[PDB]
Design a protein around this ligand. Sequence first.
Ligand SMILES: Cc1cc2nc3c(=O)[nH]c(=O)nc-3n(C[C@H](O)[C@H](O)[C@H](O)COP(=O)(O)O)c2cc1C
Length: 163
Amino acid sequence: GKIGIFFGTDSGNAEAIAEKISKAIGNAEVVDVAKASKEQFNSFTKVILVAPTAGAGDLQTDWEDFLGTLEASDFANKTIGLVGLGDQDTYSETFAEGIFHIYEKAKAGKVVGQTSTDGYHFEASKAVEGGKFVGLVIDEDNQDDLTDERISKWVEQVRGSFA
Ligand SMILES: Cc1cc2nc3c(=O)[nH]c(=O)nc-3n(C[C@H](O)[C@H](O)[C@H](O)COP(=O)(O)O)c2cc1C
């Protein structure tokens, strides 16, 4: 696979999502960030990073350890895609933020997949940037039934960049 899709998960939401996103975009290899290295991250030019949100809008532990091993340097030569899971209902003030961290570094490459906030309902989020989401935002908790179409639509918007 040309496209690498790295995810960390605690309940398999992200993993199911990354699988789906691979089903749809195609030509991809799905990797748990928990069992990988920058060495494997840099085996790819075109990447899609799926990541759930933890305490204080932080990253799921595994994604947290992983990103720790990467620096802006590592995201420079890459086309990056951001796809953060989250709960808009139980965490108003911090919704699908985890991705904003990965974002802090990945803004050093070409990040595509910015999406609208329409139909999402939250008080705050570091994931909103320049007026819209830094990438795709999944909410399996409250909006599970919207996952497939958001994926189908996002892969559409993406196709171009990840080709
Ligand atoms: C410790 C904990 C903290 C969480 N914090 C947030 C949060 O800050 N913002 C948010 O939108 N979702 C938050 N969530 C929801 C998860 O990101 C969501 O349930 C996710 O889909 C789980 O991913 P997984 O099943 O791949 O592990 C939190 C979940 C847990 C367990």
